[PDB]
């Protein structure tokens, strides 16, 4: 009467649908042997270093076909908005810059995440995590990436680790003698849009589930640089299993799952509800960041078994920096997923002078409604999460709001490392909403009247800008390479250099595109679509 | 310049502080060999079946010392409320019943969760998941536990799997040649109280974190049968990593982590903020389910590294059915954590009788004479219906059918029983979380039924409004003591409707001396309105 059924039964468990290239001469790192009558694989652990170094280098310069196809779809669809096409064209041109292998596609070169599956008879020496970490260390150290990891010295005292370590190393024990990997360079912004809901059987009917999806998709907003790969997981054996499944779904790792359930509780992809998610995404009007049809590239919906008392639900996205790479080591050597190296084949406003008193810039901006396209020329002051917290702390101790918060628009950003002979590394905006609790405070103290970032913000910012005569300008989210190549002409560290990329910067920019999202009158260009 | 630092650096990674017993003669399942100059261990996979079977049998009848000590503390602490002491005494007596090895400590014998760490040179044949699932299958099939897993035939069509499979099998690749395990029999109610928050740097200061903790602890309520083991995880490399860490922290798996951070971003336990969580829990007044000091046994707070743009936060509890067991397989055989087999040594050495065998309207009149917080003793018939029964009945009404008569004659006990031992009137049969049925009460009451419900946990405001509009009541059973309720209170169980469902059928049961509190009355009063405002 006992029948074993694995929850996950992909028809393509080794990802044969993916194209792989072999690292030249890597067969020298492996040797097939036969021990106690079973075939086994000896792996020089240096192969893990070589593979991780290659994976976390290439993933920042190339994309998968299904990602690039989505941007072209937004450009060619007659039903796409002008803003849909403008954003998708900008992201494809950004991918073209990044394919030059110098500038990463996004300033946020992400957290290094390894899902590894070591066969029972795959022998590495056992030091997999150190050797993988060294390859990750090599990738971020010797390329123009960014150190994004924040170490906690105590509960509140933090410092940057200076090398983008630690990685998330999930190494699983599996049958066989191979070593299979999924590498993810996961941006912080899309990682923040991984949501867990604790639901009940009352959700599990067509009307309630549809209303749920419409409600939750809006809470993603534009804060993770859509078009999104949207993943939705209904059920699961625990919260962490639900959240792991929705992460992997967003990486299209479970695309070959079955599409029907059975009495043993196996996972399945549900294509009908993927279609409903896409229809909700399109009919929402949120669009590719600034209103339109292309809120989403595509959807993945996986139904899981559940404890009778439980219904965990996971919602997660892959952002414009859609960065994952499959790989495996076998008796022939190291194989790594081949990404698209010619993204160019997928390609089918008000000038605002900042070199004036800030009050004159505010007056010019006041003349236009939300949704106006602007082009910034001049100085921006760069300050993100930690700078804002330090500045607020200064003011709480009676110190004045610093002068550099009062002279120029505030660009929420953290740059990647500058290539030799370049004016700037990749330097796109960070999510504006995380700074929302500072706006009214800083504006009441005479600064931060104009902010520049990406993502929809909360109502408190709209009230602050109306009360104080402020503005929030929405940059396009994602195109960090073309912004650095075309717009950013000078970068200087201004304050808090110990913060690394989270220091305060002063940059000179030209032809920096943005939208007026919040004006000084109580208007918000997202108030209709993200009510 | 490269320095590798593992995120988790426990000082006791093999759990030497835990007491283990050897499965007799289990050295016959392993043999040491040497290949390519390295020591390896061949393991008969039958050892995984044996180990899983023993783990998921023993864990339902015994508890760890640190859990039992918490209940005794609630009884002996002068600062504990009378209800704190009453609840803790009831849970200890339940544990004494459960230690008889017939009745499981809770009717929800949980999801079977296996965390396994297979050494690189530990060779099982590779079929670990099948052999582990067979041992779990054995434990739930041949013991008086419960089949709690719900399979989805499509998005909305569901059925019970009938054997408590599938398990959650998380088998990790690690150095060495041994096999180390943490087995968890995770109840549904405490699994539902695992929360993920996406926060920011603006949270990371003493005032914001303190206010955050005070706010979130209240959202746990009493819905997962406190006293809780409270785990809080600040940071993490991803949501799923944060939620895995908070789960393991709640099992005290990370008790030996360091207590300070460093520039490499290692995880650490924070004893100062553990004390703050305990102070917030105690000062909340929520208590051991019915007001008091013992909202929490103990706290675990782990600070993790984070991406500069990210601050995921996890909050999770272990409930009164605190069920985990450590184990390992090595060259000497199979070793399994030793749990406390004499819980009675932790036991140290005024209510209104309600006759339910009357017209339901007369029962409502008697209850109307008492304030919330009154302790009652129920004698008579209860109609048992939980999540699926409620959804099926609502579906019937949506298609024009009347609310069934059996929803109007007796109070509704939200519960799902474990299997009945031979010669027993009932298996373990404690209450389910009341909040999950909140959306049905006003509908059912306006159709003349469900005027009196009996379950555990605080409920939402719509239930208080419904009981006021319709002259209804919500009675809070003690949450957890499923074994002593079955042995002492439940005298007869018969299936009334939906036999095709599993333990989620509608049941008709006769009870005696079934204790409960009036939580919501017919006047707008709620016993939790102050502590869970
Ligand atoms: S800035 Fe946008 S594209 Fe870059 S990692 Fe963050 S969410 Fe992704
Ligand atoms: S009923 Fe209470 S003690 Fe039992 S599993 Fe659910 S939350 Fe835990």
d(C-alpha B118, C-alpha A77), whole Å: 51
d(C-alpha A520, C-alpha A367), whole Å: 10
Nearest to B89 by CA among B263, B385, B465, B343: B343
Is the four-CA dihedral B470, B475, B480, B486 of positive or negative sign? negative
Distance from CA of A500 to the nearest CA of B (A): 11
φ, ψ (nearest 5 deg) of residue B235: 95, -170
d(C-alpha B262, C-alpha A159), whole Å: 9
Instruction: Supply the DSSP symbol for B359.
Output: -
Distance from CA of A331 to the nearest CA of B (A): 18
Tell me how far CA of residue B227 lies from CA of B70, B281, B282, B529, in angstroms: 8, 10, 11, 19
Pairing of strands B375-384, B412-413: parallel
HSE value, Cβ hemisphere, 13 Å, CA-based, for A268: 20
With 0-12 / 13-18 / 19 or more C-beta atoms within 10 angstroms meaning exposed / middle / buried, residue B79 is exposed
**Can you spell out the DSSP letters for B296-330?**
EEEEEEEE--EETT-EEEEEEEE-SS--EEEEEEE
Note whether A371 and A516 are within 8 A (CB).
yes
**Ligand 1 contacts CB of residue A321 (under 6 A):** yes
* DSSP run (H or E) holding A55: helix A46-58
Buried b (16+ CB within 10 A) or exposed e, A466-489: bebbbbbbbbbbbbbbbbbbbbbe
Nearest to B104 by CA among B478, B428, B431, B433: B428
**Could you give the 3-state DSSP secondary structure of residue A350?**
strand
d(C-alpha B165, C-alpha B130), whole Å: 11
Percent of chain A as helix, strand, coil, to the nearest 5 = 30, 30, 40
Residue numbers after which chain B is interrupted (C to N above 2.5 A) read: 349
Pairing of strands A410-411, A373-382: parallel
Pairing of strands B506-520, B375-384: antiparallel
Note whether B164 and B147 are within 8 A (CB).
yes
Pocket of ligand 2 (CB under 6 A): B 106, 108, 187-190, 224-225, 319-321, 430, 479-480
Tell me how far CA of residue A26 lies from CA of A21, A123, A137, B358, B388, in angstroms: 11, 16, 20, 82, 56
Place of tokens 């036991």: B347
| Sheet of strand B306-307, all strands in order from the earlier edge strand to the far edge | A158-160, A149-152, B306-307
Phi-psi region of B448 (alpha: psi -120 to 50; beta: other; left: phi over 0): left
Distance from CA of A389 to the nearest CA of B (A): 7
Please tell me the total number of residues recorded for chain B in this structure: 533
Nearest to A416 by CA among A333, A355, A357, A500: A500
Note whether B528 and B458 are within 8 A (CB).
yes
CA A275-A281-A285 angle, to 5 degrees, is 140
* DSSP run (H or E) holding B464: helix B461-470
Phi-psi region of A472 (alpha: psi -120 to 50; beta: other; left: phi over 0): beta
Method: X-ray
Radius of gyration of chain A from its Cα atoms, rounded to whole angstroms: 24
Task: Give the per-residue SS3 of A464-482.
Answer: HHHHHCCEEEEECCCCHHH
CB atoms A123 and B120 under 8 Å: yes
**Can you spell out the DSSP letters for A392-440?**
HHHHHTTPPPPGGGTSS-EE-B-PPPPPTT-S-S---B-BGGGGHHHHH
Nearest to B318 by CA among B408, B228, B244: B228
**Can you spell out the DSSP letters for A366-386?**
HTS-TT-EEEEEEEEEE--HH
* DSSP run (H or E) holding A462: helix A459-468
Beta bridge partners of A171: A116
Greatest Cα-to-Cα distance within chain B, rounded to the nearest angstrom:
81
Buried b (16+ CB within 10 A) or exposed e, A497-506: eebbbbbbbb
With 0-12 / 13-18 / 19 or more C-beta atoms within 10 angstroms meaning exposed / middle / buried, residue B418 is buried
B292: tokens are 């008091």
Note whether A288 and A167 are within 8 A (CB).
no
Greatest Cα-to-Cα distance within chain A, rounded to the nearest angstrom:
81
CB atoms A152 and B303 under 8 Å: yes
Nearest to B152 by CA among A61, A307, A392, A344: A307
| Residues whose CB falls within 8 Å of the CB of residue A96, separated by 6 or more in sequence, listed in order | A343, A344, A347
**Top mutation candidate among B228, B430, B477 for ligand 2, by most atoms within 8 Å of CB:** B430
Nearest to B288 by CA among B90, B99, B66, B514: B90
Please tell me the total number of residues recorded for chain A in this structure: 531
d(C-alpha B166, C-alpha B140), whole Å: 12
For chain A, first and last CA: distance in Å?
A: 53
Report CA(A328)–ligand 1 centroid distance (Å): 27
Q: How many CB atoms lie within 10 A of CB A245?
A: 27
**Residues B11-17: contacts with CB within 8 Å, 24+ apart?**
B11/B256, B11/B257, B11/B258, B12/B255, B12/B256, B13/B256, B14/B180, B14/B328, B15/B326, B15/B337, B17/B255, B17/B256
**Ligand 1 contacts CB of residue A226 (under 6 A):** no
Pairing of strands A373-382, A350-353: parallel
Assess B45–A contact: CB distance below 8 Å, yes or no: no
Chain A interface, best mutation among B34, B39, B145, B166, by max A CB count within 10 A? B166
Note whether B392 and B509 are within 8 A (CB).
no
CB atoms A196 and B433 under 8 Å: no
- The residue of chain B nearest to residue A173, with distances taken between CA atoms, is B173
Note whether A404 and A447 are within 8 A (CB).
no
d(C-alpha B343, C-alpha B68), whole Å: 7
Resolution for this experimental structure (Å): 2.3
**Can you spell out the DSSP letters for B513-531?**
EEEEEEEE-SSS-BTTTTT
Using a CB-CB cut-off of 8 Å, the residues of chain B touching A329 are: none
Note whether A414 and A107 are within 8 A (CB).
yes
A201: tokens are 């059987």
Note whether A300 and A269 are within 8 A (CB).
yes
CA B332 and chain centroid, separation: 34
Residue numbers after which chain A is interrupted (C to N above 2.5 A) read: 348
**Could you give the 3-state DSSP secondary structure of residue A23?**
coil
d(C-alpha A113, C-alpha A18), whole Å: 20
Pairing of strands B149-152, B20-22: unpaired
Note whether B333 and B21 are within 8 A (CB).
no
For chain B, first and last CA: distance in Å?
A: 53
Place of tokens 């649908």: A17
* DSSP run (H or E) holding B269: strand B268-269
**Could you give the 3-state DSSP secondary structure of residue B207?**
helix
Residues 183-202 of B with CB under 8 A from A: 186-189, 191-196, 198, 200-202
Task: Give the per-residue SS3 of B474-505.
Answer: EEEECCCCHHHHHHHHEEEEEEEECCCCCCCC
With 0-12 / 13-18 / 19 or more C-beta atoms within 10 angstroms meaning exposed / middle / buried, residue A272 is exposed
Helices (H), B99-195: 128-142, 188-191
**Could you give the 3-state DSSP secondary structure of residue A523?**
coil
| Sheet of strand B333-337, all strands in order from the earlier edge strand to the far edge | A20-22, A333-337, A324-330, A179-186, A111-119, A168-174, B168-174, B111-119, B179-186, B324-330, B333-337, B20-22
Task: Give the per-residue SS3 of B245-265.
Answer: HHHHHHCCCCCCCCCCCCCCC
Percent of chain B as helix, strand, coil, to the nearest 5 = 30, 30, 40
d(C-alpha A236, C-alpha B250), whole Å: 19
Phi-psi region of B252 (alpha: psi -120 to 50; beta: other; left: phi over 0): left
d(C-alpha B459, C-alpha A115), whole Å: 41
Instruction: Supply the DSSP symbol for B416.
Output: -
d(C-alpha A82, C-alpha B431), whole Å: 57
Note whether A372 and A516 are within 8 A (CB).
yes
φ, ψ (nearest 5 deg) of residue A437: -70, -10
Instruction: Supply the DSSP symbol for B165.
Output: P
Instruction: Supply the DSSP symbol for B97.
Output: H
Instruction: Supply the DSSP symbol for A529.
Output: T
């Amino acid at each position: 009467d006992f029948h074993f059924s694995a929850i996950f039964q992909p028809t393509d468990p080794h990802h044969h649908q993916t194209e792989f290239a072999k690292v030249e001469g890597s067969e020298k790192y492996v040797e097939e042997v036969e021990v106690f009558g079973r075939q086994a694989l000896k792996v020089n652990p240096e192969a893990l270093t070589i593979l991780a170094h290659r994976a976390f280098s290439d993933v920042h310069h190339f994309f998968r076909k299904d990602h690039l196809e989505g941007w072209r779809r937004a450009i060619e669809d007659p039903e796409a908005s002008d803003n849909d096409r403008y954003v998708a064209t900008t992201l494809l041109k950004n991918a073209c810059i990044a394919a030059g292998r110098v500038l990463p596609s996004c300033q946020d070169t992400g957290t290094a995440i390894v899902l590894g599956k070591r066969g029972e008879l795959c022998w590495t020496g056992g030091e997999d995590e150190k050797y993988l970490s060294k390859g990750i260390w090599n990738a971020y150290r010797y390329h123009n990436l960014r150190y994004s990891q924040t170490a906690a010295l105590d509960m509140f005292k933090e410092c940057n680790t200076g090398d983008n370590l630690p990685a998330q190393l999930d190494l699983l024990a599996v049958p066989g003698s191979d070593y299979e990997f999924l590498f993810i360079a996961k941006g912080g912004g899309s990682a923040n849009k991984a949501y867990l809901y604790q639901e009940t059987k009352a959700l599990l009917n067509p009307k309630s589930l549809r209303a749920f999806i419409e409600e939750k998709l809006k809470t993603l907003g534009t804060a993770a640089c859509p078009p999104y790969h949207i993943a939705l997981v209904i059920g699961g054996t625990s919260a962490e299993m639900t959240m792991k499944t929705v992460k992997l779904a967003s990486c299209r790792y479970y695309d070959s799952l079955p599409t029907t359930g059975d009495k043993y509780g196996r996972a399945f992809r549900d294509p009908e509800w993927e279609k409903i998610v896409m229809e909700v995404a399109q009919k929402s009007g949120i669009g590719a960041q600034f209103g339109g049809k292309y809120f989403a590239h595509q959807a993945r919906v996986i139904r899981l078994p559940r404890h009778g008392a439980s219904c965990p639900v996971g919602l997660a996205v892959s952002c414009s920096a859609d960065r994952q790479i499959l790989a495996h080591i076998n008796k022939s050597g190291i194989y790594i997923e081949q990404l698209e190296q010619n993204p160019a084949q997928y390609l089918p406003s008000v000038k605002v002078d900042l070199k004036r008193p800030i009050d004159k810039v505010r007056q010019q901006l006041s003349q236009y409604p939300v949704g106006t396209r602007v082009m910034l020329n001049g100085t921006l002051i760069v300050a993100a999460d930690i700078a804002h917290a330090k500045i607020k702390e200064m003011m709480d101790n009676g110190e004045p709001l610093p002068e550099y918060m009062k002279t120029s628009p505030i660009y929420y950003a953290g740059p990647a490392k500058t290539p030799e002979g370049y004016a700037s590394g990749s330097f796109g905006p960070t999510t504006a909403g995380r700074m929302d609790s500072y706006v009214d405070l800083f504006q009441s103290h005479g600064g931060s009247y104009i902010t520049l970032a990406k993502g929809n913000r909360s109502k408190q910012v709209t009230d602050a800008c109306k009360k104080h005569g402020g503005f929030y300008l929405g940059s396009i989210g994602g195109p960090a390479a073309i912004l650095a190549k075309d717009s950013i002409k000078q970068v200087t560290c201004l304050a808090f250099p110990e913060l690394g990329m989270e220091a305060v910067w002063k940059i000179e920019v030209e032809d920096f595109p943005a939208f007026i999202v919040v004006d000084d009158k109580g208007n918000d260009m997202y108030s209709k679509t993200l009510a």
